Design a protein around this ligand. Sequence first.
Ligand code: HEM
Ligand code: HEM
Ligand code: HEM
Ligand code: FES
Ligand code: FES
Ligand SMILES: [K+]
Ligand code: NA
Ligand code: NA
Ligand code: NA
Ligand code: NA
Ligand code: NA
Ligand code: NA
Lengths: 157, 156, 157, 157, 157, 157, 33, 57
Amino acid sequence: MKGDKKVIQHLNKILGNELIAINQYFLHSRMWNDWGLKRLGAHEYHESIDEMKHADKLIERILFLEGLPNLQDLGKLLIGENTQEMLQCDLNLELKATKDLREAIVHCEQVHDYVSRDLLKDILESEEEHIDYLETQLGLIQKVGLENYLQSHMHED
Amino acid sequence: MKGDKKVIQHLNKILGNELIAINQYFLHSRMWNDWGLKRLGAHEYHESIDEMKHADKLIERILFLEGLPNLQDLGKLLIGENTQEMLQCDLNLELKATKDLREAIVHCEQVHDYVSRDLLKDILESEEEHIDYLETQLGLIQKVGLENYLQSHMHE
Amino acid sequence: MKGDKKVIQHLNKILGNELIAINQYFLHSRMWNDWGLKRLGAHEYHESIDEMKHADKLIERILFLEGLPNLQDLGKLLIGENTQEMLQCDLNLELKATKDLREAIVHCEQVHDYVSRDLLKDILESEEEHIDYLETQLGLIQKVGLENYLQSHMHED
Amino acid sequence: MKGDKKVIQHLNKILGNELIAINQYFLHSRMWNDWGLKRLGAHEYHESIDEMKHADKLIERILFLEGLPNLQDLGKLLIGENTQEMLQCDLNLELKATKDLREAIVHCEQVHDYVSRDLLKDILESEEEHIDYLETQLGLIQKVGLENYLQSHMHED
Amino acid sequence: MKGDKKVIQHLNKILGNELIAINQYFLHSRMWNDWGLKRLGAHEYHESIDEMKHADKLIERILFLEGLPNLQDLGKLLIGENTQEMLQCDLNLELKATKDLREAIVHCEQVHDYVSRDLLKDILESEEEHIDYLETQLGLIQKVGLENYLQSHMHED
Amino acid sequence: MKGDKKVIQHLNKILGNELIAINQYFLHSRMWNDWGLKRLGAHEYHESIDEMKHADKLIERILFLEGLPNLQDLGKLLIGENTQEMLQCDLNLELKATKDLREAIVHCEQVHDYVSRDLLKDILESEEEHIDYLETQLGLIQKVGLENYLQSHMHED
Amino acid sequence: MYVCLCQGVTDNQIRVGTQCGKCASLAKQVVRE
Amino acid sequence: MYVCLCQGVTDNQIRDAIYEGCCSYREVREATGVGTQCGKCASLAKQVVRETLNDLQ
Ligand code: HEM
Ligand code: HEM
Ligand code: HEM
Ligand code: FES
Ligand code: FES
Ligand SMILES: [K+]
Ligand code: NA
Ligand code: NA
Ligand code: NA
Ligand code: NA
Ligand code: NA
Ligand code: NA
């Protein structure tokens, strides 16, 4: 078995985080579409797809390292009731995800699994870009007002 | 005469409902265009067209079953005076339409007219999508405010 | 309201006539299709569509003039039971329609609503073309015989 | 064996009906061609092909359900001697077919084989469209006269 | 009636053989598809179609000669239970078919129906090609072994 | 709330089954790729994607009916240790899925939710096609032998 | 909303039926309230 | 089959732990880690333990 056991635990932890995000973002997307906020719905749909792609890369790496990917343990989804609360739920989730990614990276570095580190760093860059998006949307709600913010997200690009 | 008499009565009733909707939606469309809400006008025009196509299929089915399509009796149009009321009027009409579709389908199933059932099922799916659209708009008025909602429907 | 009250009544009267024609022609079309006289069916379908387009223009004009278009009152459809009766029914309807159009035009002229007059004149020209078509078909039945006439209308194109 | 035995019997009954129709329509088609009524011959050829396609779908469904498709029992072909009698033979056959389809559907519904029901419903729609065609042709013989009706079917579309 | 009565009987006999082969090959095809042997299923489907085309030409020739094509009588299908038996069943059917074709040709020559002879000789050539294919397949089972032979026919070309 | 409460419970139950299948098929896919059985990996990836699309349609329908789609509850995955066990695990899952779909359809019919019934019937048709594929694969293992079966799935199409 | 389209009478104007009469029942109701 | 995906425990590994001296599910769990994470497998793991101990008689 070529894989370090704690590296595999860390990868499975990040994978578990991605699985929560997949489902949370997908449900939020479909809620925004049901409400007629199609621009938000489309954007959130693409966030969910992106997490699916990260999950796939984690699953493949775990198997290469001779571990078993954990697709069974699904943690708590943070579902909002309205647009602002949904954005904040996505942000709370991402802040927990990035903390775990950083710890995973520390450990990879310590045991010299430089390829797993590089994978996790790429995921981290993407998650930080998501945090940038989320903080921006919450800022815009304050700058343009909620009613305008929502109006601007009725129609798709 | 191959058609069941109660099936033909049900199909004529649904046709009656589509004929009301055609006229109501067409008038609402042209009122929205008159007011310069052209995106609502265009959307509503397509709803009217879609009802026309359903009416066509009902007429064709009634004739195949050797019934007499009734295009003479036009029921009551629900015409609103402002955007919010026009949308609610379309919704009230649709709630009645779908109730009648379900009853027609029950009857077709009972007398084994499975093809008439499938025609009605397809109509019902379309009318349910229209309900989805109507509730969504009424909800947007609440979420973005009436002035923004109308603004968003000025331009196609 | 900017429009003359009797102009609006006239336009609503013409609209009322178009609404009868739309349904009468549409039903005749589908009866002909049901019987396999597809060429008659297709031609009558286009007559129905043309009446719809006239109705649309009347509705638009009535709203511009600040009247209320009447789509609620539907008068008597003249439905025939065979080809000869259906054509004569359409002709009977068109003769009444053109009489009302001329009376409406007289009134628009008197109150200087020249744009409404021009719209009505355009509809009138179309209805007179339909009369020509109907008189021609009735004449062809006499000339070629009913059986040949119907045969000639079985296939489209 | 996943299939309900009576569902399989019903499917084999419909299959048996399609096999009769395949042969009856094919022979009628080739008789119309021999007589120089090429438009009828072509149309009837396509009716035969359509029944072949229905038969194929039944055969595939029976095998999926772990039954044995019955291509051995061929019922009575109703062959006509002249155009009107051939059309009526096709109609008599279709009226028996649609009765069997409806009974099959009742049974599928009762045992919750909703996919077999949907297959049979699609077949039924097609057979009813054939009945519409047949009733139309017989009506046209009366409206335009037999000699004109036949003339109109000499040349292909 | 321009046709020799015994020629027409021979043509109907060949037709009857083609009609058996259509159904036998079609069922074998669909059985192979059900089992996932798609290359055999596809090849056998095309054999069925080719028999359909021969039957058509036979029906056309019988009509020209003013006989009655017989599509009502369907003899016994030979349906196998596994790939080796199905191939052998097709081969048994084809050896009977070619014997009948040779006897039909003899009689055509005797009564100077050279066009019917030519049609039968064309069919004979096709059935001999089918015999070649069948003997080849049965030989390949011996040379490559049954498991390899079936493997090679899982995926379509 | 326009939706029948028990319909929504049934739709959530079907959703829960789809969510299990997404993860089970995705993991089986990636396991097969890891082992170099790329044709199985690719086929199973597409099965996972198809379950994702069903889940989407379910979530959309539940929202329209004004229920709460449940993406939080993830039941037990059946993950096999070798190709034969993995296929059987998928098949076990699918037999449970189709039983639940039939029960959901019964209830839809009873409360006249014909559009929800139609959606479920479409899903049922797809799951039955998957059952067909699985039984076929397990049958091919027997017919061609396990080593040949695996060989045939090393290289992608 | 319009109670009578023929005459353009809204429910608020009531708070008619002379032309086609399809609205009579509704107008009579708005009145009986 | 994998009985526990979180800890990668198969039904054969549960039998092995019993054959090697585990006397109960709790002992198998200490030996293998089965059911120590999400817990969704616990009832299936218990069933395998139960069947195994019963067959050992
Ligand atoms: C383990 C969990 C999942 C994984 C690893 C996963 C992975 C993937 C991948 C790799 C794709 C292809 C992306 C691309 O390259 O375009 C995809 C597509 C997609 N996913 Fe997932 N997915 C998961 C769960 C879900 C769930 C739970 C849903 C919905 C509730 C979902 C909805 C979709 C949809 C709608 C598509 C697009 C499919 C198409 O139309 O082609 N996924 N997924
Ligand atoms: C107020 C009454 C009606 C109005 C104002 C109206 C108006 C129109 C208009 C403007 C079009 C588009 C024409 C074009 O640009 O080519 C149209 C199309 C059509 N109409 Fe009507 N119509 C009316 C009633 C009906 C009825 C009662 C029926 C059938 C029962 C019908 C059947 C159709 C059909 C089948 C089309 C073509 C739809 C397509 O694009 O597929 N119409 N109508
Ligand atoms: C079990 C009975 C039969 C079945 C299941 C069957 C099925 C089929 C199918 C699936 C096709 C392809 C249709 C397409 O997609 O274009 C076909 C074609 C055809 N069939 Fe049949 N068939 C049967 C019997 C017959 C018979 C008895 C005849 C003639 C007497 C016939 C004449 C033809 C002809 C001429 C074609 C066109 C072939 C070509 O030129 O490509 N079929 N059949
Ligand atoms: S709607 Fe009031 S009279 Fe016509
Ligand atoms: S599956 Fe065993 S603890 Fe999660
Ligand atoms: K091999
Ligand atoms: Na205006
Ligand atoms: Na909505
Ligand atoms: Na001839
Ligand atoms: Na007809
Ligand atoms: Na199979
Ligand atoms: Na590997």
